[PDB]
């Protein structure tokens, strides 16, 4: 056990020079950088942690574990606004990595900033990401009521991903919430959109189920 000031400071020095020589030694694999920053955070010296993460991102910024460990460290230590700036830089420079958008939105929801979460979801959808992202957005709109927003999203969605399956899901959505006239309009729009030259079973099956 470390009595006090000078002995734990020597302990700091020894571990610290060990880390820094590892980094000088390889300067690559980020297991070293992360071990180091994890330690300097465990001692609650987080300005050193921030410097370490920044230097690491200077080495290799395309590495997503680095960004995630970093924003996690900021978030635990309640540095909310630091975490926001980090998520923003991350989704700016690596916009295809979906984890970043997911976790940024999830945080902003926890924190109670629903306006913020919608801002982020909108920015995300600008990239025309993937079905799962659109679903996540709609589910977000559905944990709150806001069903009109949900159908606006669905309008953009079925255009961005024109698959029969999505048209089906859209119709199913509106019927589950009992907008039967609108679901009929959905189905007629679906048929007239797809056209004969492609048109096959699944769509008609669901259309028959509805009208049945």
């Amino acid at each position: 056990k470390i009595t006090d000031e000078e002995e734990l400071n020597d302990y700091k020095l020894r571990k610290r020079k060990t880390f820094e020589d590892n980094i000088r030694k390889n300067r690559t694999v980020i297991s070293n950088w992360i071990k180091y920053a994890q330690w300097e955070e465990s001692l609650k010296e987080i300005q050193r942690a921030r410097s370490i993460y920044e230097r690491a991102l200077d080495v290799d910024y395309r590495n997503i574990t680095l960004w995630l460990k970093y924003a996690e460290m900021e978030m635990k230590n309640r540095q909310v606004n630091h975490a926001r700036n980090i998520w923003d830089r991350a989704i700016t420079t690596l916009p295809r990595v979906n984890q970043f958008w997911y976790k940024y939105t999830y945080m902003e929801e926890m924190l109670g900033n629903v306006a913020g979460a919608r801002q982020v979801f909108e920015r995300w959808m600008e990239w025309q990401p993937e079905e799962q992202a659109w679903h996540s957005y709609i589910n977000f709109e559905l944990r709150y009521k806001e069903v009109d927003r949900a159908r606006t999203i669905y309008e953009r969605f079925v255009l961005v991903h024109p698959d029969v399956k999505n048209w089906i899901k859209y119709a199913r959505f509106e019927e589950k919430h009992a907008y039967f006239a609108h679901a009929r309009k959905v189905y007629e729009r679906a048929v007239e959109f797809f056209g004969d030259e492609h048109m096959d079973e699944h769509l008609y099956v669901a259309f028959a189920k509805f009208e049945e």
Partner: protein, 114 residues
């Protein structure tokens, strides 16, 4: 009454596991329409911003909120800590491994040479 199941598969991409975890966490959350309407009647049309449309500088959170996300952080961190389930130190079988690195290399060799 309700019923569902979800089976585990290959980790295929880190994205798949991340997505599963997000699904679970999302399903958990329960939002208060009270605070939603309260926040609503103050700001109104600002509520519905496009990516590019509207702007208010910063939304400053009551600390009590911040505690929610911190707690969820600790929970997910633990759950992630348990990622690899360790197999108990079983000495019962024959030992042709000098140390634990060698024992694990022999195990990887067992999985590629049948």
């Amino acid at each position: 009454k309700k019923k569902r199941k979800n089976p585990d598969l290959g980790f295929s991409d880190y994205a798949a596991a991340q997505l599963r975890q997000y699904h679970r966490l999302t399903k958990q959350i329960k939002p208060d329409m009270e605070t939603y309407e309260r926040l609503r009647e103050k700001h109104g049309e600002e509520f519905f911003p496009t990516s590019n449309s509207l702007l208010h500088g910063t939304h400053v959170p009551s600390t009590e909120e911040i505690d929610r996300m911190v707690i969820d952080l600790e929970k997910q961190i633990e759950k992630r800590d348990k990622y690899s389930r360790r197999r108990p130190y079983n000495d019962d079988a024959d030992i042709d491994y000098i140390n634990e690195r060698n024992a694990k290399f022999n195990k990887k060799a067992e999985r590629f040479y049948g």
